Structure 1
């Protein structure tokens, strides 16, 4: 706190000089007082007691990266500019495994012709891709 603000105040913003003794003016040390006298604060902070669910090992689980069709469509010109994509006979041939994306979602609009190869496709993503005349290949 601002020490110079309190030169000549005695109590230094604490009230009586009987406050600020030690751990008993805080109710215990740490998150102490779980549900006897700090129960309401315990519930509001996000420290409620309980155990709920299980965990799978991290060896087997994976966290897929995603990209929506709108995002993939809008930045296609920049992708071919960087040499990532390819523009043979007009339709963009864009491969998602060189970027680092394992699944294509479907939020947004698609207007350009896209030939997208990847591992996974939501149903709506495939519907939107092929309603614009494009094609999707399950990359293996």
Structure 2
């Protein structure tokens, strides 16, 4: 802390000099006393007792990476500029297998004909893609 500010104040912003002694001026060490005298602090900070649920193995569980149809529609031209997609017959042919995204969600609007191929599309993503004239193809 500011050492030079408290040169002269004796207690150094600590009240009694009987304060600031050891673990007894904090109520134990670590996040201790969470069932007896730090119950409310345990509730406030998330230390509250209990176990809930289970975990599947990480080798089988997988967290897919997603992107919304609004993001694809409103920067598909940036995809064609970057080289990750091209334009055939006025329909922006965009593949999800190389952009790293594996699921498509229909958050937002679709305007241009996007021929989107990906691992799995949401139902509303399929709806918004097919309303605009594009198509969805599941890619192995």
**Deviation (angstroms), 1:40:** 0.8
Quick one: distance in 2 between partners of 1:8 and 1:114?
73
Aligned equivalent of 2:133: 133
Q: Matched residues in 2 for 1:119 and 1:16: separation?
A: 66
Aligned residue for 1:108, secondary structure, equals coil
CA-CA distance at 1:15 after TM superposition: 1.0
Under a length normalisation based on structure 1, what TM-score does the superposition of the two structures give? 0.97
Q: Secondary structure at the match of 2:137?
A: strand
> What are structure 1's unaligned runs of at least 5 residues?
none
RMSD, aligned CA: 0.8
Superposed displacement of residue 26, structure 1: 1.1
Structure 2 CA distance for aligned equivalents of residues 39 and 19 of structure 1: 23
Aligned-pair CA distance for 1:113: 0.6
Q: Going by fraction, where is strand more abundant, 1 or 2?
A: 2
1:131 is displaced (CA, Å) by 0.5
Q: Offset at 1:25?
A: 1.1
TM-score (normalizing by structure 2): 0.97
CA-CA distance at 1:35 after TM superposition: 1.1
Shift of 1:70: 0.4
Task: State the shift of 1:16 in Å.
Answer: 1.2
Match of 2:44 in 1: 44
